[PDB]
């Protein structure tokens, strides 16, 4: 655990005291004859750093709606806000990830901080259903099911497979 | 910031949740559509690095006195105790320092754990105070003063300088 330098009030002495661990702050500088005592921060306070400091930093003001918190003002940290899953940060707020449509795919996943990008769907892949999560899916391999190609996919659908 | 898997009560999906921060245990985890959400250690536990864990560890028991405590039990570290400034640590409990008697000074500084060791002041040197805590002093060089030794010095008091 590191130190750090404090006058002494009553004889003017230039003490090196122990730092107090991150989460807490000093409560009582060491003294030539007894050690500093360190304190947790009080709720709504942080340090992030083993420090020599007197009172904790306060937090952040309350996430603003639909923001939510994805780290609490706790003793260690600061809070942390963020557009909640499936939304992603638009200058001011929170809009929700983009869906793509049937026959499109996700190419890259959204964030919270970047929409999702769709793409179509390359040939011999499909997608049957609206998300903003899922990709395109390759068709059933009707070749390896030692079965034939009964009806074509589409960029909507699987092929259907069969005999004859 | 790292990651923990969890099995998802409601559907068995085997999830990667975002670990908390030390000082704050995982009060929910996360599931499908929802953060994981982390709570400050309450007064009396710690945990010391991030992690997945549903409750914080209890801090271990106040110090017997005359022990006090290095550091508190705060969010991030249980309490730590020690023998006193001026104590060490000597089987059961605390222990005064040796005090080098006049005539003696301390070679090496005591600490929480191990006593002060005095030695004898060698030669030119002197101490004429008892303490735990000084070493022997050095003669005023009275040739470097202008002046001449009036009173030789001894191992517990200052040479006297002066001239004739």
């Known amino acids: 655990i590191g130190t750090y330098r404090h006058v002494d009030r009553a004889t003017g002495q230039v003490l090196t005291c122990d730092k107090?661990?991150?989460?807490?702050?000093?409560?009582?500088?060491?003294?030539?004859?007894?050690?500093?005592?360190?304190?947790?921060?009080?709720?709504?306070?942080?340090?992030?750093h083993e420090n020599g400091i007197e009172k904790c930093h306060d937090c952040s003001q309350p996430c603003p709606w639909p923001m939510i918190e994805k780290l609490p003002c706790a003793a260690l940290t600061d809070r942390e806000c963020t557009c909640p899953p499936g939304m992603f940060?638009?200058?001011?707020?929170?809009?929700?990830?983009?869906?793509?449509?049937?026959?499109?795919?996700?190419?890259?996943?959204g964030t919270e901080t970047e929409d999702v990008r769709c793409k179509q769907c390359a040939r011999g892949t499909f997608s049957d259903?609206?998300?903003?999560?899922?990709?395109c899916k390759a068709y059933?391999?009707?070749?390896?099911?030692?079965?034939?190609?009964?009806?074509?996919g589409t960029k909507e659908t699987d092929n259907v497979c069969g005999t004859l």
Chains 1, 2 share one sequence.
């Open 20 to 48: 107090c661990p991150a989460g807490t702050y000093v409560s009582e500088h060491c003294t030539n004859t007894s050690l500093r005592v360190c304190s947790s921060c009080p709720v709504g306070t942080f340090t992030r």
């Open 129 to 135: 259903v609206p998300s903003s999560v899922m990709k």
């Open 89 to 109: 940060q638009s200058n001011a707020t929170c809009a929700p990830h983009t869906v793509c449509p049937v026959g499109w795919g996700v190419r890259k996943k």
């Open 140 to 152: 059933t391999d009707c070749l390896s099911q030692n079965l034939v190609v009964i009806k074509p």
